[PDB]
Design a protein around this motif. Structure first.
Motif, PDB file in Angstrom:
ATOM      1  N   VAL A 182      -5.846   2.067  -6.470  1.00 16.14           N
ATOM      2  CA  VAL A 182      -6.197   1.008  -5.933  1.00 16.14           C
ATOM      3  C   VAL A 182      -6.361   0.263  -6.509  1.00 16.14           C
ATOM      4  O   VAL A 182      -7.818   0.567  -7.022  1.00 16.14           O
ATOM      5  CB  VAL A 182      -6.182   1.674  -4.099  1.00 16.14           C
ATOM      6  N   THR A 213      -1.913  -0.804  -3.575  1.00 15.82           N
ATOM      7  CA  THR A 213      -1.989   0.696  -4.046  1.00 15.82           C
ATOM      8  C   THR A 213      -0.888   1.162  -5.594  1.00 15.82           C
ATOM      9  O   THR A 213       0.450  -0.129  -5.291  1.00 15.82           O
ATOM     10  CB  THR A 213      -1.140   2.517  -3.652  1.00 15.82           C
ATOM     11  N   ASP A 239       0.736  -1.526  -0.454  1.00 17.00           N
ATOM     12  CA  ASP A 239      -0.174  -0.033   0.023  1.00 17.00           C
ATOM     13  C   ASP A 239       0.239   1.260   0.274  1.00 17.00           C
ATOM     14  O   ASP A 239       0.362   2.743   0.465  1.00 17.00           O
ATOM     15  CB  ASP A 239      -0.738   0.069   1.320  1.00 17.00           C
TER      16      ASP A 239
END
Ligand code: CL
Ligand code: CL
Ligand code: K
Ligand code: MG
Ligand code: MG
Ligand code: MG
Ligand code: MG
Ligand code: MG
Ligand code: MG
Ligand code: MG
Ligand code: MG
Ligand code: MG
Ligand code: MG
Ligand code: MG
Ligand code: MG
Ligand code: MG
Ligand code: MG
Ligand code: MG
Ligand code: MG
Ligand code: MG
Ligand code: MG
Ligand code: MG
Ligand code: MG
Ligand code: MG
Ligand code: NA
Ligand code: NA
Ligand code: NA
Ligand code: NA
Ligand code: NA
Ligand code: NA
Ligand code: NA
Ligand code: NA
Ligand code: NA
Ligand code: NA
Ligand code: NA
Ligand code: NA
Ligand code: NA
Ligand code: NA
Ligand code: NA
Ligand code: NA
Ligand code: NA
Ligand code: NA
Ligand code: SR
Ligand code: SR
Ligand code: SR
Ligand code: SR
Ligand code: SR
Ligand code: SR
Ligand code: SR
Ligand code: SR
Ligand code: SR
Ligand code: SR
Ligand code: SR
Ligand code: SR
Ligand code: SR
Ligand code: SR
Ligand code: SR
Ligand code: SR
Ligand code: SR
Ligand code: SR
Ligand code: SR
Ligand code: SR
Ligand code: SR
Ligand code: SR
Ligand code: SR
Ligand code: SR
Ligand code: SR
Ligand code: SR
Ligand code: SR
Ligand code: SR
Ligand code: SR
Ligand code: SR
Ligand code: SR
Ligand code: SR
Lengths: 132, 337, 53
Positions: free
Chosen positions: B52, B68, A84
RNA sequence: CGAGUGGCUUGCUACUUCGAUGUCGGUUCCCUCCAUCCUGCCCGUGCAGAAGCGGGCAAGGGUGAGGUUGUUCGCCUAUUAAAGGAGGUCGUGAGCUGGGUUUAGACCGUCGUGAGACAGGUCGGCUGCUAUCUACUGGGUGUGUAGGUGUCUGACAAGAACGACCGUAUAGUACGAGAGGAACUACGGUUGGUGGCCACUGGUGUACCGGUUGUUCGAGAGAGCACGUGCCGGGUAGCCACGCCACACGGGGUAAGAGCUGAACGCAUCUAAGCUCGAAACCCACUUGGAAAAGAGACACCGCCGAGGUCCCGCGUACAAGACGCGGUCGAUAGACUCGGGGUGUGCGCGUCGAGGUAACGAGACGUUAAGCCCACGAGCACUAACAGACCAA
RNA sequence: GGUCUUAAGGUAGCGUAGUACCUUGCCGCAUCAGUAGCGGCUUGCAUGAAUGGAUUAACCAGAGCUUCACUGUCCCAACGUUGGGCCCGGUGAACUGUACAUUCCAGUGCGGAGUCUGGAGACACCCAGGGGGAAGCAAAGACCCUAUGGA
RNA sequence: GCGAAAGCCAAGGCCUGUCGGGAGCAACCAACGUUAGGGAAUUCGGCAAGUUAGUCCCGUACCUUCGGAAGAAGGGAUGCC
RNA sequence: CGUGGAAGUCUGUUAGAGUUGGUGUCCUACAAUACCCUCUCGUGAUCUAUGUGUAGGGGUGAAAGGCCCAUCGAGUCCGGCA
């Protein structure tokens, strides 16, 4: 090796001093090699979090000093990257002495560990106190 | 004995001179497999943002988990396939046989072209069919172009013209498919040839760096230790040995760096769209606010904002297509933080 | 998520997570504020932060 | 014992240079050889497997980091798939280094009556020059092909654009009594190389905002200097790597090798004709360049009295000159104005509190004030400036 | 050997040394690894007593090595600053020049060729560059020998 | 301020360490600033650069020719009102 | 404990003297020995101005064959000399 699960930036090189986070009696460790690493002309072989590095006992008990032992880089100062994008860094770069079969040489693991190290060296993981 | 080391920089992209046409020109088109179709589209680089998604890789354990991913925004408004070029097969490769044009042109196509006044489409077309009838028709490409005017961020109105191959169907079938497209106004969108999830080949002319030294240009070391104080810092050891008594053209030397054509492979189209969904707060720096036709191309794209990028179905794909990936979040966060 | 320092509603795919000697986890929305803690400064103490305003 | 190839060691010769071809080692950068260390395909085995041992084809790629010594060499350590060797004036000093050799100073050992010596050791001890030619990297101007625009072609040229490893499943399976212990295949990642890019992390940021020391303008405000920011903090755009993105399979033809049909030689035989296969190596594939390819190209349109181009003006996706690209009122090209998006961190003045002090005075806190100040970005906005017009041209 | 040359025949000490050829001597220290450094051993190729020997507190731009600390010395380079560098006005030299000269690949030749032989390549001019070549330029070689040379 | 020290400023002197103009001003060079992680891995050798740093207090080893070593080392303090 | 204020004593870009390293800049130079940073001494065998003495196989030399007007293992000029 089994994909770490995160992108690192080897915070250490050969000859670099790190802390041996455990109870083996070994305090300071000197990176000497990086299991499965072949560099390129004129380069300090880079050691990073989640690497099985060959190491030397710098500071420690009389029995432990001067010993060439294997270890797993558990912590490091230079940030790594998680899926992420978020970065993660440690208060210090440290390693856990591991053995022939890649199981810790001690019993206690001082300080945190990365949830990426767990995947590979689970025997080390199923010993880790804090797992970040 | 002096350790080994790979040479500094690649020899494939030589000579490293400025490009002739800032508009990329593919030198290899996709194979004819599916239905008749044009083999590429083009747009204009807008900027970068992340997005994302939900992992598509059926092999990755991350499959199903959010992730991401960076993305280059490219405004890709409708182009106009203004003509149809035919190639006859001669003992010296392909040669343009003849072209077929139209009536309805873009109001500003004359900014770059000498727009037709008297063309004989039906006749020209005959030439192509008689050549196919003879068994000499090679491949069919459509003279195409863009409507820079459509994109506000881009100052240029003066259209960017480029030819594109058409393939897929049997010579006859695709030939007609071409004419059909052209025999209208030639208007077509990126969705007329692509679909999110498909890997494409983006080609473009690199960012302008001007003349630069060996270090920057060919990635050569700087002088080290004591050698960096004697009056030599970014200069290399030498230009060669005693003999050969000459300078081999393979030694890293100062020169023009940048503004080269590059064909960046396997660029996955993360999402094709239209609107202000990808635009950023404050506006894409040194570009502007996006609103309308576009594409979110995974990763970097050769060239600076405002430059004409060209797409093409991946000629050498490595993985299998995962049409329409679940795009959960597209960043609107400002690019001035 | 949200910054464990100033309190900004952190942007996904942008950030830094920090572990400590103790082993806690303090997130950062930017190195701008990261380097504030290096100066002993607090989020509440510093007016310009979402905490102090 | 005999036969050779090489030209890397050494030696021999004294052809070449004494009106000077700079030393050793190292370094940096490019090309190469194969007598191949690794990687690929293979044969043999004292080939169960696994790990080997020897041999063949093969030069695509790789062959790394360190400890002592100036060393070359070599010794040693830990990693590795492996950490191969040689050539290029023992490649490379109009590139670098100057540790050793080999000046002038000096010490020790030895020899010497002595000056002084040493094919011993040791401390110290300098590195010139503005590139005419040529060569290659890149950048222009012309002539040729013989009005203009746009799009192509592809002889040719370059590439390593990829190389290697680990892990998973295969599988504790094949195999082996056991110990031990694979493969095909399909997957994930790492490393080295490669080209590109900046959403994110990271660096810079002598734009900018803030704290603050000394001194000067009386104080306050606000400012200059302290090296080309006084120092400290934070730092956007940009550039960047330490960040991020992409870098096949498959075909075709062979080598070594495995074979097929097959004769000379009724059999036999992979070969003599013929054929099936088979290397990381070759061609293709992919990327790059490429009408000056003198057979000097192709197509479409426009125009020869007008197509088009230059000049000019406003500017960058371009840029050392030149070049390049875009806009020029039928306009958003640049500037100002205003938003928006950002940087800093809460303005001057005033009010209050404020340790105290008779009072004067008072560092500071607070409120006013997420204030004031600032922006290399975006939007809106033709207000300002893209005006005026000149020239070339079949 | 258990005196002989030639008078005596190395004593205290110091010793692999700035002296030790062998030599990276053996041992230990130290490091992952130490021809280095220190200690010890030491038959010292060829240590040694005013040709002074040993010792040493203090002193040193003297020689060698180790540790802590620091860091762009390095990994591996980046951005920035100031003066140049680039274009323009003005000023305005010098080094060098047998001739020709667009070169490359081989060959050849007094055996180290832009110019010879054979090939290949090559339209002219100009800008910036880093210096591969002209066995580049600069000094009638300091090295070596020679001279019925010099000091 | 210890200071004939630095830095700043007078009195005084000067813009004659005497060529200018233009390009966010490229490559490359001289001076120089800042560099994440690591930290001498660089090199013959930490060459270069850096670190340290004033003043007060506590405290300070071996050895020593008693003079010294010694600012050893080490630890704390530091402005303003 | 105080007083005293010794020293070829210390720190020091006080003036002044010297010159370790960068083998940095320069090397048709600013300069036929220069610029910059670093570095050493800095009350003494100290530094310095002017005046004066020693002259060539001779001075002078805390000794490097150093110095004696860019000239030193024997100055410089002219002559011997073609
Ligand atoms: Cl170098
Ligand atoms: Cl290693
Ligand atoms: K010679
Ligand atoms: Mg090296
Ligand atoms: Mg940004
Ligand atoms: Mg940010
Ligand atoms: Mg030469
Ligand atoms: Mg062979
Ligand atoms: Mg090869
Ligand atoms: Mg030596
Ligand atoms: Mg050589
Ligand atoms: Mg050379
Ligand atoms: Mg030289
Ligand atoms: Mg020497
Ligand atoms: Mg002498
Ligand atoms: Mg020179
Ligand atoms: Mg010894
Ligand atoms: Mg001579
Ligand atoms: Mg001689
Ligand atoms: Mg004589
Ligand atoms: Mg650092
Ligand atoms: Mg080394
Ligand atoms: Mg130094
Ligand atoms: Mg006198
Ligand atoms: Na220089
Ligand atoms: Na040479
Ligand atoms: Na031979
Ligand atoms: Na050399
Ligand atoms: Na090879
Ligand atoms: Na070595
Ligand atoms: Na030579
Ligand atoms: Na050399
Ligand atoms: Na030199
Ligand atoms: Na094959
Ligand atoms: Na003696
Ligand atoms: Na002295
Ligand atoms: Na630096
Ligand atoms: Na040259
Ligand atoms: Na003499
Ligand atoms: Na007394
Ligand atoms: Na000096
Ligand atoms: Na005389
Ligand atoms: Sr094309
Ligand atoms: Sr092509
Ligand atoms: Sr030098
Ligand atoms: Sr030659
Ligand atoms: Sr092999
Ligand atoms: Sr040799
Ligand atoms: Sr040896
Ligand atoms: Sr070599
Ligand atoms: Sr030397
Ligand atoms: Sr000697
Ligand atoms: Sr002609
Ligand atoms: Sr396996
Ligand atoms: Sr088992
Ligand atoms: Sr200033
Ligand atoms: Sr065969
Ligand atoms: Sr032509
Ligand atoms: Sr004795
Ligand atoms: Sr030059
Ligand atoms: Sr004044
Ligand atoms: Sr003047
Ligand atoms: Sr800064
Ligand atoms: Sr060292
Ligand atoms: Sr070293
Ligand atoms: Sr202290
Ligand atoms: Sr003194
Ligand atoms: Sr030196
Ligand atoms: Sr200078
Ligand atoms: Sr000089
Ligand atoms: Sr310096
Ligand atoms: Sr002093
Ligand atoms: Sr005094
Ligand atoms: Sr005479």
């Amino acid at each position: 090796m089994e994909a770490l699960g995160a992108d690192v930036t080897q915070g250490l090189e050969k000859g670099s001093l790190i802390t041996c986070a455990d109870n083996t009696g070994a305090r300071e460790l000197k990176v000497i090699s990086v299991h499965g690493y072949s560099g390129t002309k004129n380069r300090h072989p880079k050691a990073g979090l989640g690497d099985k590095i060959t190491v030397s006992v710098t500071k420690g008990t009389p029995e432990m000093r001067r010993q060439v032992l294997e270890a797993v880089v558990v912590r490091q100062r230079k940030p790594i990257r998680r899926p992420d994008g978020t970065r993660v860094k440690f208060e210090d770069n440290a390693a856990v002495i591991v053995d022939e079969n890649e199981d810790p040489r001690g019993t206690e693991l001082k300080g945190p560990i990365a949830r990426e190290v767990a995947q590979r060296f689970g025997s080390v993981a199923s010993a880790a106190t804090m797992i970040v | 004995p002096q350790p080994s080391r790979p040479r500094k920089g690649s020899l494939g992209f030589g000579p490293r001179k400025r490009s002739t046409s800032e508009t990329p020109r593919f030198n290899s088109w996709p194979s004819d497999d599916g239905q008749p179709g044009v083999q590429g589209f083009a747009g204009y680089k807008a900027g970068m943002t992340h997005v994302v998604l939900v992992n598509d890789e059926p092999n990755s354990p991350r499959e199903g988990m959010e992730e991401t991913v960076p993305v280059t925004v490219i405004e890709t408004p409708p182009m106009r396939a203004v003509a149809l070029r035919a190639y006859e097969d001669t003992p010296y490769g392909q040669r343009p046989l003849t072209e077929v044009w139209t009536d309805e042109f873009h109001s500003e196509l004359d900014r770059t072209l000498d727009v037709p006044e008297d063309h004989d489409p039906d006749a020209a077309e005959e030439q192509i069919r008689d050549a196919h009838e003879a068994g000499d028709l090679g491949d069919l490409r459509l003279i195409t172009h863009t409507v820079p005017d459509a994109v506000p961020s881009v100052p240029k109105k003066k259209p960017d013209v480029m030819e594109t191959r058409v393939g897929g169907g049997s010579v006859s079938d695709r030939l007609d498919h071409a004419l059909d497209i052209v025999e209208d106004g030639g208007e077509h969108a990126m969705n007329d040839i692509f679909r999110a999830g498909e890997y494409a080949d983006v080609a473009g002319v690199t960012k302008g760096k001007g003349t630069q030294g060996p270090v920057k240009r060919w990635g050569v070391q700087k002088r080290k230790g004591k050698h960096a104080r004697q009056g030599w810092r970014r200069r290399i050891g030498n230009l060669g040995p005693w003999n050969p008594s000459r300078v081999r053209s393979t030694v890293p030397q100062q020169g023009q760096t940048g503004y080269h054509q590059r064909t960046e492979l396997n660029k996955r189209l993360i999402d094709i769209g239209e609107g202000d969904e990808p635009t950023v707060d404050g506006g894409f720096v040194n570009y502007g606010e996006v609103d309308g036709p576009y594409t979110l191309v995974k990763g970097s794209v050769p060239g600076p904002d405002k430059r004409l990028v060209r797409f093409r179905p991946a000629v050498r794909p490595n993985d299998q297509p995962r049409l329409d990936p679940e795009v959960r979040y597209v960043s609107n966060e400002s690019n001035q933080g | 998520r949200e910054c464990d320092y100033c309190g900004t509603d952190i942007e996904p795919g942008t950030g830094t997570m920090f572990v400590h000697k103790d082993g806690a986890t303090t997130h950062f929305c930017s190195s701008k504020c990261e380097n504030n803690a290096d100066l002993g400064r607090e989020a509440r103490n510093l007016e310009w932060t979402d905490t102090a305003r």
